[PDB]
Design a protein around this motif. Structure first.
Motif, PDB file in Angstrom:
ATOM      1  N   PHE A 193       0.802  -1.197   0.000  1.00  0.00           N
ATOM      2  CA  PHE A 193       0.000   0.000   0.000  1.00  0.00           C
ATOM      3  C   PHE A 193       0.842   1.256   0.000  1.00  0.00           C
ATOM      4  O   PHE A 193       0.493   2.244  -0.638  1.00  0.00           O
ATOM      5  CB  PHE A 193      -0.874   0.044   1.259  1.00  0.00           C
ATOM      6  CG  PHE A 193      -1.928  -1.003   1.345  1.00  0.00           C
ATOM      7  CD1 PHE A 193      -2.892  -1.074   0.384  1.00  0.00           C
ATOM      8  CD2 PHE A 193      -1.993  -1.864   2.429  1.00  0.00           C
ATOM      9  CE1 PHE A 193      -3.939  -1.981   0.506  1.00  0.00           C
ATOM     10  CE2 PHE A 193      -3.004  -2.803   2.539  1.00  0.00           C
ATOM     11  CZ  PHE A 193      -3.986  -2.850   1.564  1.00  0.00           C
ATOM     12  N   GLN A 194       1.929   1.218   0.761  1.00  0.00           N
ATOM     13  CA  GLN A 194       2.812   2.352   0.838  1.00  0.00           C
ATOM     14  C   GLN A 194       3.504   2.582  -0.517  1.00  0.00           C
ATOM     15  O   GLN A 194       3.591   3.733  -0.971  1.00  0.00           O
ATOM     16  CB  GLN A 194       3.791   2.172   2.001  1.00  0.00           C
ATOM     17  CG  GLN A 194       4.682   3.366   2.190  1.00  0.00           C
ATOM     18  CD  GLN A 194       5.454   3.263   3.488  1.00  0.00           C
ATOM     19  OE1 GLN A 194       4.854   3.365   4.562  1.00  0.00           O
ATOM     20  NE2 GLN A 194       6.759   3.066   3.399  1.00  0.00           N
ATOM     21  N   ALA A 195       3.948   1.510  -1.189  1.00  0.00           N
ATOM     22  CA  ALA A 195       4.547   1.680  -2.511  1.00  0.00           C
ATOM     23  C   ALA A 195       3.551   2.324  -3.476  1.00  0.00           C
ATOM     24  O   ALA A 195       3.878   3.249  -4.217  1.00  0.00           O
ATOM     25  CB  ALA A 195       5.036   0.350  -3.038  1.00  0.00           C
ATOM     26  N   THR A 196       2.302   1.878  -3.477  1.00  0.00           N
ATOM     27  CA  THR A 196       1.270   2.399  -4.339  1.00  0.00           C
ATOM     28  C   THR A 196       1.016   3.868  -4.031  1.00  0.00           C
ATOM     29  O   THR A 196       0.822   4.688  -4.932  1.00  0.00           O
ATOM     30  CB  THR A 196       0.007   1.539  -4.263  1.00  0.00           C
ATOM     31  OG1 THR A 196       0.364   0.221  -4.688  1.00  0.00           O
ATOM     32  CG2 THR A 196      -1.134   2.092  -5.090  1.00  0.00           C
ATOM     33  N   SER A 197       0.928   4.203  -2.731  1.00  0.00           N
ATOM     34  CA  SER A 197       0.698   5.573  -2.312  1.00  0.00           C
ATOM     35  C   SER A 197       1.841   6.475  -2.804  1.00  0.00           C
ATOM     36  O   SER A 197       1.626   7.577  -3.303  1.00  0.00           O
ATOM     37  CB  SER A 197       0.594   5.669  -0.807  1.00  0.00           C
ATOM     38  OG  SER A 197      -0.494   4.915  -0.284  1.00  0.00           O
ATOM     39  N   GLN A 198       3.083   6.020  -2.595  1.00  0.00           N
ATOM     40  CA  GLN A 198       4.253   6.781  -3.014  1.00  0.00           C
ATOM     41  C   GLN A 198       4.279   6.962  -4.529  1.00  0.00           C
ATOM     42  O   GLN A 198       4.640   8.037  -5.015  1.00  0.00           O
ATOM     43  CB  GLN A 198       5.535   6.137  -2.493  1.00  0.00           C
ATOM     44  CG  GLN A 198       5.679   6.273  -0.986  1.00  0.00           C
ATOM     45  CD  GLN A 198       6.870   5.496  -0.501  1.00  0.00           C
ATOM     46  OE1 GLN A 198       7.097   4.354  -0.899  1.00  0.00           O
ATOM     47  NE2 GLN A 198       7.601   6.099   0.424  1.00  0.00           N
ATOM     48  N   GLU A 199       3.892   5.947  -5.274  1.00  0.00           N
ATOM     49  CA  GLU A 199       3.844   6.026  -6.722  1.00  0.00           C
ATOM     50  C   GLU A 199       2.751   7.006  -7.163  1.00  0.00           C
ATOM     51  O   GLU A 199       2.943   7.693  -8.163  1.00  0.00           O
ATOM     52  CB  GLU A 199       3.780   4.631  -7.353  1.00  0.00           C
ATOM     53  CG  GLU A 199       2.417   4.040  -7.621  1.00  0.00           C
ATOM     54  CD  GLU A 199       2.410   2.521  -7.733  1.00  0.00           C
ATOM     55  OE1 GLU A 199       1.423   1.988  -8.244  1.00  0.00           O
ATOM     56  OE2 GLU A 199       3.385   1.877  -7.289  1.00  0.00           O
ATOM     57  N   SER A 200       1.652   7.108  -6.415  1.00  0.00           N
ATOM     58  CA  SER A 200       0.603   8.039  -6.755  1.00  0.00           C
ATOM     59  C   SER A 200       1.083   9.483  -6.565  1.00  0.00           C
ATOM     60  O   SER A 200       0.859  10.344  -7.415  1.00  0.00           O
ATOM     61  CB  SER A 200      -0.670   7.780  -5.951  1.00  0.00           C
ATOM     62  OG  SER A 200      -1.141   6.449  -6.117  1.00  0.00           O
ATOM     63  N   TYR A 201       1.738   9.772  -5.445  1.00  0.00           N
ATOM     64  CA  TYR A 201       2.333  11.083  -5.227  1.00  0.00           C
ATOM     65  C   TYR A 201       3.340  11.387  -6.337  1.00  0.00           C
ATOM     66  O   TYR A 201       3.396  12.485  -6.877  1.00  0.00           O
ATOM     67  CB  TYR A 201       3.017  11.149  -3.860  1.00  0.00           C
ATOM     68  CG  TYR A 201       2.150  11.597  -2.709  1.00  0.00           C
ATOM     69  CD1 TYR A 201       2.031  12.928  -2.405  1.00  0.00           C
ATOM     70  CD2 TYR A 201       1.497  10.684  -1.869  1.00  0.00           C
ATOM     71  CE1 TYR A 201       1.300  13.383  -1.327  1.00  0.00           C
ATOM     72  CE2 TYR A 201       0.777  11.140  -0.776  1.00  0.00           C
ATOM     73  CZ  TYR A 201       0.666  12.494  -0.494  1.00  0.00           C
ATOM     74  OH  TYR A 201      -0.026  12.992   0.600  1.00  0.00           O
ATOM     75  N   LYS A 202       4.216  10.447  -6.632  1.00  0.00           N
ATOM     76  CA  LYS A 202       5.289  10.689  -7.592  1.00  0.00           C
ATOM     77  C   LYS A 202       4.708  10.884  -8.978  1.00  0.00           C
ATOM     78  O   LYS A 202       5.223  11.735  -9.745  1.00  0.00           O
ATOM     79  CB  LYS A 202       6.273   9.533  -7.530  1.00  0.00           C
ATOM     80  CG  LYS A 202       7.527   9.684  -8.340  1.00  0.00           C
ATOM     81  CD  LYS A 202       8.542   8.606  -7.979  1.00  0.00           C
ATOM     82  CE  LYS A 202       8.014   7.205  -8.219  1.00  0.00           C
ATOM     83  NZ  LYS A 202       9.007   6.183  -7.820  1.00  0.00           N
TER      84      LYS A 202
END
Ligand SMILES: CC(=O)/C(C)=C/C=C/C=C\C=C\C=C/C=C/C=C/C=C/C=C\C=C\C/C=C/C(=O)O
Length: 225
Positions: A45-54
């Motif tokens: 979930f954290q990887a997905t969240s970070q990818e959304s911000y990026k």
């Protein structure tokens, strides 16, 4: 008479795009980058969240509306005086051609602004999904949950900043075409609200100074995400 200078909010004393308006979202983006990476349950979930911000920041950089505006403002310094001279010479064919060119450039900057807004609003839909997933999947304390909440709090107001920039520039494009359409049809001095070509140029130059500064500040910031 039509206003050929920048329109609100781009005529505001404080340039509307910067840490003044986007600083909470910027801080949230910095925190999302730096989330700890020890928790197994949260990792995907954290990887997905970070990818959304990026994704959204990368999209912002692709568009770079302030940099594009600054380029336009440089052009405006000569393009508006030239148009004003055509208006004063009652030169319809020239005024139309010159206004068409100015409008094309304005509408391209407006589209870049609109594209940033779209990225942020689409990002909010991702955050809505993430919030629901994590409320159930990640029971305890997880900083990523706060990062999602931050996105939900700050994205729509941030998008609105870009939508307002878009609206302003599209209105400027409409106005410059409409002004040229009057040339030769009504008295020249009744067409533009401003009293000289130089006054219009100076107003775009002032905006350009502000847009340039912001473009450079943003460039720095995004290169550290
Ligand atoms: C679906 C699923 O499974 C899960 C887990 C989804 C989770 C999503 C989490 C977060 C989403 C964030 C989205 C967008 C962020 C956007 C952040 C944007 C930050 C912008 C900061 C500053 C902008 C400055 C602009 C300057 C440009 C200029 O002046 O030209």
């Amino acid at each position: 008479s039509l206003t050929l200078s920048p329109l609100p909010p781009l005529s505001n004393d404080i340039y509307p795009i910067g840490r003044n308006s986007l600083g909470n979202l910027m801080t949230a983006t910095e925190k999302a980058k730096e989330l700890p990476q020890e928790d197994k349950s949260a990792a995907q979930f954290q990887a997905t969240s970070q990818e959304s911000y990026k994704s959204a920041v990368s999209q912002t950089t692709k568009e770079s509306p302030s940099a594009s505006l600054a380029k336009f403002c440089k052009e405006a310094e000569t393009a508006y005086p030239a148009l004003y001279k055509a208006i004063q010479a009652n030169d319809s064919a020239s005024a139309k051609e010159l206004a068409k060119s100015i409008a094309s450039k304005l509408t391209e900057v407006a589209t870049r602004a609109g594209n940033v807004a779209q990225a942020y609003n689409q990002g909010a839909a991702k955050a809505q999904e993430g919030q629901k997933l994590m409320k159930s999947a990640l029971p305890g304390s997880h900083p990523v949950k706060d990062s999602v909440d931050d996105a939900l709090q700050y994205l729509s107001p941030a998008a609105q900043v870009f939508t307002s920039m878009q609206s302003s520039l599209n209105e400027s494009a409409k106005n410059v075409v409409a002004a040229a359409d009057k040339v030769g049809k009504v008295p020249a001095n009744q067409i533009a609200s401003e009293d000289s070509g130089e006054a219009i140029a100076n107003a775009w130059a002032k905006l350009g100074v502000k847009a340039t500064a912001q473009a450079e500040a943003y460039n720095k910031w995004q290169g550290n995400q």
